[model samples]
Target chain A: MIIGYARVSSLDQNLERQLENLKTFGAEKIFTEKQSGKSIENRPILQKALNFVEMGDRFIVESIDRLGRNYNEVIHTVNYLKDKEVQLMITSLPMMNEVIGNPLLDKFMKDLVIQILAMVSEQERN
Target chain B: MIIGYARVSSLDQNLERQLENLKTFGAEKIFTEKQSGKSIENRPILQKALNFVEMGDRFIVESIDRLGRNYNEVIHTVNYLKDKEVQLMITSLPMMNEVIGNPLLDKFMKDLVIQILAMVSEQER
Candidate 1:
């Protein structure tokens, strides 16, 4: 199964463009979550996306930043999908050039560097 | 006294550029903060910047987002400065052209619209 997840940062308020693109990319199901005014609870549907995936499934998102609410959450989410054996694909970060082997591993290592500082940044609240 | 404050988002690790610019803009004194690994207590010196301002003082920063840890913090920090009667200046957002009237008020309204959404963005967490 091909599953998609699209999200915006806390103030970002659109999913239509992401949805359209994911649909075009052949997602059989797409889960979405976006934050708006006075939302006390955060990104609830993000969990369901994790729960919905199984082995041999392909998961898609617009960008790695779209995966979770924060850097910690994004890391854990990726770790979870990798553990579950789902084929993870990030549309915005499609492989720019061919790698000789284990393109998937290259994909993971490559963007971990990009995300090292792409803001949607980490925070420690007081 | 003219004071300045500079900061970066969590993974952002540079202060020299922001510091140099603030100094160039005539900041007599500047307060700065940045996050490193396991910094559970965020931006502690931010409070000192607030406390350091006095009535009629001018406070400078590279951007409004640099003022606080989050949007509500930013708003309240601005409110705190306003309450202290300090003139606030953001380097990244300056009055593009001279306004006939209160350029200050125009500056306020103009960038409230721009900050309606910008990257360094707003978060509910």
Candidate 2:
């Protein structure tokens, strides 16, 4: 199964781009929220999507920052999905894929890339 | 004048401790929010507080994380306040204070301490 998660910082913000992207990517189920990507606890729709996934499911997001603004939170969510045997797909980051080839090396590279991207996103937010 | 900003990630979370600390520290105006400290764009109260300050005003937060989880965001906000001649006061980080004594050294130390604290807070989160 392929699940998509889309988020915007606030209600006034538009989620159309993300939603259209996810739909175009053929997401089977989509979870959308108009909330800050600061913490996982604040996003109920994201939690529902996480909870709804099963083993071997693929989770898709518009971008890395769509998962969360903080590196720790983003890493935590990625690891959680990996642990559940679910693959994470970031539309913006093409190199990111399932942790199948070499668990440790794949995780290291993915974390490094995501960390850098998250930092860049944070800088852009300011 | 002294202003305080307090934030929590969720509605279920308590803001009492932050409120108490800010009040006890003698904050003249306090802005509180039950929302994520992810991006300043999501925080209207914080924006209001930031806009309300004048030169030499002090802005207080309970901890460095209360400002934001991202290192860049925290640094950006601190620098913004600094440019406005506003001082940032983090109750938990004692080394953070007004940039009064030595302009160059004070700013350097303040930035260094905040960057480190922000990293640690991100780790904790």
Candidate 3:
């Protein structure tokens, strides 16, 4: 199944565009969260999505930013799901597909990107 | 067995006080986390507690915040344990014990607490 997961930092952010893209990308179901990725329970949609996704299923997201604003955390969540054998396809980031084919390679790329992005994201935070 | 799970939002946060409390409370085995509860994979201690807990074993937390900062998530996790026939005990949130009654009462109280907290938190946001 192609399960789309969309999220925004707050409820004020619009989701119509993301949802439309997800639907256009062949998502059978979509999960959305209107809160920061910092707290899991606050996002009911993500929890529901996690419950629904099974091995061999695919999880589609509009972008890595939708999953989380935190670079390391986004890397961790994506790699963990990949470890579980759930395929991830990002609409905004084309490079994700290249690394995702090989689990070890995926981890390496994710870690590298995370390290570089973590520094920049943190710098932007302050 | 009473298995205690202690967690802090980040690695830099101290675990000593929480561990001391868990030990004092007679936790036979304790799991500690140095990460947030937002993602299950990141909190190794919480995951360990889930894996180690057996039916009839009690899982104890120092506070609800230790389990989850968001109220609904804590309730969902607690309900999951109950479904597995595991008992969950919270040290700080004493009122939570009120829900451990008969199955019917348990469901009703769980819904009540969750609804109230969810609404309040959403409003605050």
Best by TM-score: 2
Candidate 1 pairs with clashing backbones: none
What is the two-chain DockQ of model 2? Answer: 0.01
Q: On residues B38-96, what C-alpha lDDT tens digit does candidate 3 reach at each position?
A: 55546665867887888999888776566765555656677778778776665554344
**Model 1 C-alpha lDDT per residue in residues B6-118, reported as the tens digit of each score:** 77654455577788879988999887676521222465776777788899888888765566435555666666777889987767654344321335534554455334422
Interface RMSD, prediction 3: 21.6
> Which model, 2 or 3, shows the larger TM-score?
2
- TM-score order of candidates, best first? 2, 3, 1
List ranges where model 3 is wrong by over 4 Å.
Answer: A99-107, A114-126, B1-125
Error of 3 at A100 (Å): 9.7
**Model 3 residue A5 CA deviation in Å:** 0.8
lDDT of 2 by residue, A1-126 (tens): 999999988777668888888887769899988887667788899999999998988899988889888777777888899799998887775434544223553455456566777776666665
Interface RMSD, all models, one decimal each?
A: 20.9, 19.6, 21.6
lDDT tens per residue, model 3, A26-95: 8988887678765455777886886688899988887656676566666666676768789777675443
Which stretches of candidate 2 lie above 4 Å from their native place? Answer: A1-126, B96-103
Residue-by-residue lDDT tens digits, candidate 2, B76-106: 8888898999888777644324332335434
